[PDB]
């Protein structure tokens, strides 16, 4: 169930769902696992806000345990293509792909909650078949791992060698450490 | 003098 709200306007009264009201203010919600359907829905939201106003900052709240890589990369390329600065905020948790979209936000407009947690690891996969086919899928996932580390260094500012060592296994980063790591800019403790 | 102006 979704609660309905009333937006008082000069023309009259209108009824909106809680998710649609925030969309009017250039706010998008990323909840649950990242899949092809959920990822394709957020892309349409960004384009809609671009046409309404290309000079206003967009805010993306992320609370997700991660998911498919290909579904997440469609969002990353979209944020970089459009002119507006996509601000990112981490609520609850940010897994491997959730962390990549978090750091991919506009520089200086990235925040993490005081008790939020980020986790990063290497891509996961698998295949069953002939040895010739296993070699093909192995080379492909290796390129993605290298590509995902290259982009992570670009936004975080760290070196590619550091990302390779830190992403070999699961690595949890508290909210203060994320700032020191270049992943985010500040923490939104209180409203000033 | 007195105006009775009303609209439904």
């Amino acid at each position: 169930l979704v609660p309905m709200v009333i937006e008082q306007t000069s023309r009259g009264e209108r009824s909106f769902d809680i998710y649609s009201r925030l969309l009017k203010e250039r706010v998008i919600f990323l909840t649950g696992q990242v899949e092809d359907h959920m990822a394709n829905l957020i892309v349409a939201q960004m384009l809609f806000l671009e046409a309404e106003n290309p000079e206003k900052d967009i805010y993306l709240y992320i609370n997700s345990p991660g998911g498919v890589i290909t579904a997440g990369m469609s969002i990353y390329d979209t944020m970089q293509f459009i002119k507006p600065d996509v601000s990112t905020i981490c609520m609850g948790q940010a897994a491997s792909m959730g962390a990549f979209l978090l750091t991919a936000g506009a520089k200086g407009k990235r925040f993490c909650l005081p008790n939020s947690r980020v986790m990063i690891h290497q891509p996961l996969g698998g295949y069953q078949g002939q040895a010739t086919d296993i070699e093909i899928h192995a080379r492909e996932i290796l390129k993605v791992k290298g590509r995902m580390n290259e982009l992570m260094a670009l936004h975080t500012g760290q070196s590619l060698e550091q990302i390779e060592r830190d992403t070999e296994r699961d690595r949890f980063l508290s909210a203060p450490e994320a700032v020191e790591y270049g992943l985010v800019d500040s923490i939104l403790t209180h409203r000033n | 003098x007195x105006x009775x102006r009303x609209x439904x």
Partner: protein
């Protein structure tokens, strides 16, 4: 005429509006600067300098106009539009105002054209069997401002002779408290409010107060109220007056000779008893006055509401040479102390 001296005299009778006094000195000086040696310029269509006052109730609009008339040498008029019925109806007509101006100038056309005009309660003429005091008054006044020569019978008519006194040279000061003029300005300035973390959320009232809201007004906002755009076009100048200040309330009761404290003092001096008001009681009164949102006009309520018991019991009481009012008296919890 000196802007530095006219402001010094108005400071004696008016307090709390420093910006508005600067505006009036400039517009008033520019009005006469054109009449004496103006309209002999390389560039044509010199804009007529006018004044448009806007402020809340008890903001001293009437006092500013009055203080100007006494200071100023030429005559001055106070002609409200509450009863201004157009097309020569039973109530009144706009022509009488021209007539009253001559009475102040003693039928001096050379001296009357250099006069000043002030109107109060201009909100009441806003456009809404027939309407007499509605939009019709704007039409008659509009000719008076844009510029036109009218016909006034000297001495009322013994012959059918009239005086063709110019009007473009006479100044006009349209001023009156506009009720509801804050919600319209609020819509434009507010521009909505954000909902997310980074966006700032407005409190109950931060910039929605009367002060700092009229300065950013524009001519298009007044059109929605009911006024005609052509009428506002002839008055590019605007004067925004602050509601009040806490310090000014303390000064109004002490420096002016007509202060309320001095009024009640003489009321008891005839009875053979003294009166006193300490400074701790004055500042306490100012806090309660601003809460009423009525101005200096609503100040007598706080005084008589406190001295009700003090005045009712007083006659029966004997040996009370002097009465002292403590800060607690304003609160009402403790009665005023008596001096024997």
């Amino acid at each position: 005429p000196t802007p530095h001296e006219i402001r010094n005299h108005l400071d004696d009778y008016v307090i709390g509006q420093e910006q508005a006094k600067k505006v009036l000195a400039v517009a008033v000086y520019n009005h006469y600067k054109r009449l004496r040696n103006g309209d002999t310029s390389n560039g044509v269509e010199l804009g007529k300098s006018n004044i448009l006052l806007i402020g809340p109730t008890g903001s001293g609009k009437t006092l500013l106009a009055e203080t100007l008339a006494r200071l100023l040498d030429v005559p001055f008029t106070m002609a409200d539009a509450t009863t201004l019925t157009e097309a020569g109806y039973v109530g009144e007509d706009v022509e009488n105002i021209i007539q009253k101006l001559l009475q102040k100038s003693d039928y001096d056309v050379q001296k009357a054209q250099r006069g000043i005009v002030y109107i109060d309660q201009i909100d009441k003429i806003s456009r809404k069997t027939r309407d007499v005091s509605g939009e019709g008054v704007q039409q008659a006044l509009l000719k008076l401002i844009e510029g036109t020569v009218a016909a006034v019978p000297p001495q009322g008519g013994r012959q059918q002779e009239f005086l063709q006194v110019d009007t473009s040279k006479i100044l006009f000061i349209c001023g009156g408290a506009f009720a509801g003029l804050d919600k319209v300005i609020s819509h434009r300035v507010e521009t909505g409010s954000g909902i997310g973390f980074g966006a700032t959320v407005k409190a109950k009232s931060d910039k929605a107060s009367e002060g700092e809201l009229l300065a950013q007004v524009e001519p298009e906002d007044l059109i929605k109220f009911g006024l005609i755009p052509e009428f506002i076009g002839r008055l590019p100048v605007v004067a925004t007056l602050n509601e009040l200040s806490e310090e000014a309330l303390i000064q109004i009761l002490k420096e002016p000779k007509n202060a309320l404290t001095k009024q009640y003092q003489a009321l008891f001096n005839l009875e053979g008893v003294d009166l006193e008001f300490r400074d701790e009681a004055l500042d306490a009164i100012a806090k309660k006055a601003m809460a009423r949102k009525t101005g200096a006009r609503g100040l007598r309520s706080i005084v008589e509401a406190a001295l009700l018991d003090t005045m009712y019991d007083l006659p029966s009481m004997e040996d009370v040479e002097k009465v002292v009012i403590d800060e607690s008296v304003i609160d009402g919890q403790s009665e005023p102390l008596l001096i024997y």
